[PDB]
Amino acid sequence: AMSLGKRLKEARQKAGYTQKEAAEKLNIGNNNLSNYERDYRDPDTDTLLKLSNLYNVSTDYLLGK
Amino acid sequence: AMSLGKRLKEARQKAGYTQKEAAEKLNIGNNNLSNYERDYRDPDTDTLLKLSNLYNVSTDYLLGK
């Protein structure tokens, strides 16, 4: 009931970005970020780091340490 | 010249585990762990968290944050 996708959404909301704002800044298609936030797709570790970087959180936070 | 593979290797050696001891604790193939340490294959985020747990390190560390 808690997931990486849910923390990615929440962290993006904390940073102020809309989905398309975040995707375009990360040069990822909008559907891909949507798929990640919904836990439909597991991000590769490079992307995981880029998103931690854009939202100003630790990847440890997103993963549920 | 530095990579996730290289930090997983170092972090595992710091924890004291051999490659197969670590593979067996996490029930992943010895070849699979070797492929990760060698940067031949990207760990899925689940495996990345388990290994960070087994070595007592941050996923941020392994990722180069």
Numbering used by the authors:
A (entry chain B), B (entry chain A): 0 to 64
Q: What is the paper's account of this structure, in its own sentences?
A:
ICEBs1 is regulated by the ImmR/ImmA tandem, which are a transcriptional repressor that constitutively blocks transcription and a metallopeptidase that acts as anti-repressor and inactivates ImmR by proteolytic cleavage. Regulation of ICEBs1 is exerted by the Int integrase, the ImmR transcriptional repressor, and the ImmA anti-repressor metallopeptidase, which are counter-transcribed from the PimmR promoter of the transposon. In contrast, if the global DNA damage response is launched or if potential recipient cells lacking the transposon are nearby, ImmA inactivates ImmR by proteolytic cleavage, which unleashes ICEBs1 expression and promotes transposon transfer. We here report the production and purification of 127-residue ImmR from ICEBs1 and the crystal structure of its DNA-binding domain.
After successive rounds of model building and refinement, the final model comprised residues M1–K64 of molecules A and B, plus respective N-terminal alanines (A0) from the purification tag, and 167 solvent molecules. Remarkably, the final Fourier map did not show relevant density beyond K64 of either protomer, which would be compatible with the full-length molecule set up for crystallisation being proteolytically processed after this lysine by a trypsin-like contaminant. The protein is a compact almost spherical pentahelical bundle (α1–α5) cohered by a central hydrophobic core, in which the N- and the C-terminal helices are nearly antiparallel, so that the chain termini are adjacent. Helices α2–α4 form a flap that folds back onto the two terminal helices. Following the nomenclature of HTHGBB-DBDs26, helices α2 and α3 would correspond to the “positioning helix” and the “recognition helix” of the HTH-motif engaged in double-stranded DNA recognition. The two protomers in the asymmetric unit (a.u.) are related by a dyad, which gives rise to an interface of 573 Å2 (ΔiG = − 2.1 kcal/mol; ΔiG P-value = 0.42427). The main participating residues are L3, D41, T44, L47, L48, S51, N52, T58, D59, L62, and K64, which are provided by helices α4 and α5 plus the linker preceding α4. Finally, the experimental structure is in very good agreement with the predicted dimer. Accordingly, the DNA major groove would be contacted through the recognition helices, and flanking helices α3 and α4 would play a supportive role. Putative residues engaged in binding would encompass T17–E20, N29–N31, S33–Y35, R37, and Y39–D43 of either protomer.
